[PDB]
Design a protein around this ligand. Structure first.
Ligand SMILES: O=C(O)CNC(=O)C(=O)O
Ligand SMILES: O=C(O)CNC(=O)C(=O)O
Ligand SMILES: [Zn+2]
Ligand SMILES: [Zn+2]
Lengths: 14, 338, 338, 14
């Protein structure tokens, strides 16, 4: 659950 | 849905008019424009809903920025400049390009000095060419001293308080965006919290909440256009994307000195107004607050989006090939969950 | 596809004939019938493919078992007996019944002593009733001394070697199955390796490989009928289950003294022959060999089935409700992977 | 991967 709901930091840039 | 065009101070007339806005198939309603001192503004940022703040002074020293000043002072570093045949500047992740050999990007990236960028703009303008350029470069320590002074003059007091108040993570970067009139960044969502600080010109921002995932049809997570909508807003394919007929946006036009809070996972479509001249923006990207130890149900829409992303990522790694994720998902649902 | 009926020894005529087999919509080809000394048999069990072994003597002491002997000797423990209106005895997991309140089972489970089971059979037979009973009870230490002697007389030398040779885990249980002629266990797969030892009467076994997952449409993993096919083999719904038109089975009829290897994750449909009298089987369920430390690609079909099961299980736990797994999976694929 | 390919011991019995 906690593993699944984790979010990244990806944005439209390098 | 944007609202009535604001009247500029000193009887300067409407800052813009509706004829400078592109025409789309969906309705919108306005994003609230509030003072940073308005408790309703603090209530919207705490609930992770968008708001335009009119008086933050967040990038007050940059409001004097134009191409001449920047070229003189921004240093001799390299700037990422995107070029396209069309007004639509769809972002693509170059690392993911290996996964899909078929994908060919509409826009191209070139590294150049700031004066070369200004030169291409002049050249295109002089010859009346149809090429379009969008400069998108994170601010770094190669900038000139005057820019460093301007950057230091941003309202860190206010935005550091916001970061602390919301429990957000670190500021990860500031993206400098300089676009030509009519440039469009197509609908997409970002994973970080964003304070979007408009500096020069006007940008129409159309936002969609995370719970409209099923109407925006993002690319597969392994595709280079991960996080972007597959729907062509100018010619929507309702046979492939039927629920795009149900999308409703939140709209505003930001001008110099306006700051738009774009909450994480919120879709946004951003266009520089037709015939409005060049636009300049600096954003402020923050990592979201850490997930709470005790997860609370019901889950938020963006948590369900995170689950889907993570499922797609796990399957790609487990199957050993990103191309196989689609077939396995269909096998799992057909005649079983549909 | 079963093959020509075998001729019984001492000129006793065909053990059975095709008229005792139910009629279905798909083709089959025969499962090989081999000696346990045949290296081809060892090659099929090592490749996890089915085979009928004709001379294992695996349950030789049980070949004298009938209802009289068992009632006299099997002890006074409780036996699970399933009752149904129809010939189809679809298995359901009672723990999962809370998740789906709508599901109502066709068959009912009742606990009774072995002599009560024999009594119901006699009663049904005497009155010419249409009710059907299937006894399905794991062997346990409440059995009588004679049964213990018979059980000890099984060919543990041969099957322990098989377990060692294949790296399987422990024997988890032995299921005693006593059915009425015409009883059917509908298509399903089990997660454990199975040596299926026929004792009395004849059973037609139709097996499908794990790579026919997309033609058998198992229930959702949280549904009580997890691992069973949704397709009614007697009246297949090709609109809901179109790829059932592509299924091809592996078929055999096992008789007293035959042992069928049913590899783990292989689908099987098992029916006691029409007008063939009662059937008695004892199976041998083993945990599969541990997954190798280095996974090798390409993945086997049953590994992909395991991935799908695990995705369904994770989503049920993450969403906090098994009912929500279907909607999220559709949201993930529609217009994105289909 | 190893987590995903893991298999249970469920059969048509208790
Ligand atoms: O301004 C643009 O054209 C695009 N900007 C963004 O998507 C952003 O700041 O998150
Ligand atoms: O024999 C039957 O009717 C059913 N048996 C099985 O599914 C099994 O042994 O795995
Ligand atoms: Zn963005
Ligand atoms: Zn079974």
């Amino acid at each position: 659950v906690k593993f699944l709901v984790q979010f990244g930091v990806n944005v439209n840039a390098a | 849905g944007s609202g009535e065009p604001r009247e500029e101070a000193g009887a300067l007339g409407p800052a813009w008019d509706e004829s400078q806005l592109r025409s789309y198939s969906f309705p919108t309603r306005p994003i609230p424009r509030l003072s940073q001192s308005d408790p309703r503004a603090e209530e919207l940022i705490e609930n992770e809903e968008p708001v335009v703040l009119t008086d933050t002074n967040l990038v007050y020293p940059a409001l004097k920025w134009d191409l001449e000043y920047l070229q003189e002072n921004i240093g001799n570093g390299d700037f990422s400049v995107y070029s396209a045949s069309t007004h639509k500047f769809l972002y693509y992740d170059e690392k993911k390009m290996a996964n899909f050999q078929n994908f060919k990007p509409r826009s191209n990236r070139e590294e150049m000095k700031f004066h070369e960028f200004v030169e291409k703009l002049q050249d295109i303008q002089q010859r009346g060419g149809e090429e379009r350029l969008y400069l998108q470069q994170t601010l770094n320590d190669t900038v000139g001293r005057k820019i460093v002074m301007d950057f230091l003059g941003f309202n860190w007091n206010w935005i550091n308080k916001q970061q602390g108040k919301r429990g957000w993570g670190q500021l990860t970067s500031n993206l400098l965006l300089i676009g030509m009139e009519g440039n469009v960044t197509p609908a997409h969502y970002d994973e970080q919290q964003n304070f979007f600080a408009q500096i020069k010109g006007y940008k129409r921002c159309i936002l969609f909440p995370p719970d409209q995932f099923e109407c925006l049809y993002p690319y597969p997570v392994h595709h280079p256009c991960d996080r972007q909508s597959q729907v062509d807003f100018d010619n929507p394919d309702y046979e492939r994307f039927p629920n795009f007929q149900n999308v409703v946006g939140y709209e505003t036009v930001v001008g110099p000195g306006d700051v738009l809070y774009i909450p994480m996972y919120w879709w946004h479509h951003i266009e520089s107004l037709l015939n409005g001249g060049i636009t300049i923006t600096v954003n402020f990207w923050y990592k979201g607050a850490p997930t709470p130890k005790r997860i609370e149900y019901p889950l938020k829409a963006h948590q369900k989006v995170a689950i889907m992303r993570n499922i797609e990522k796990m399957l790609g790694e487990a199957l050993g090939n990103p191309q196989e994720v689609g077939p396995l998902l269909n096998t799992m649902i057909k005649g079983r969950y549909n």
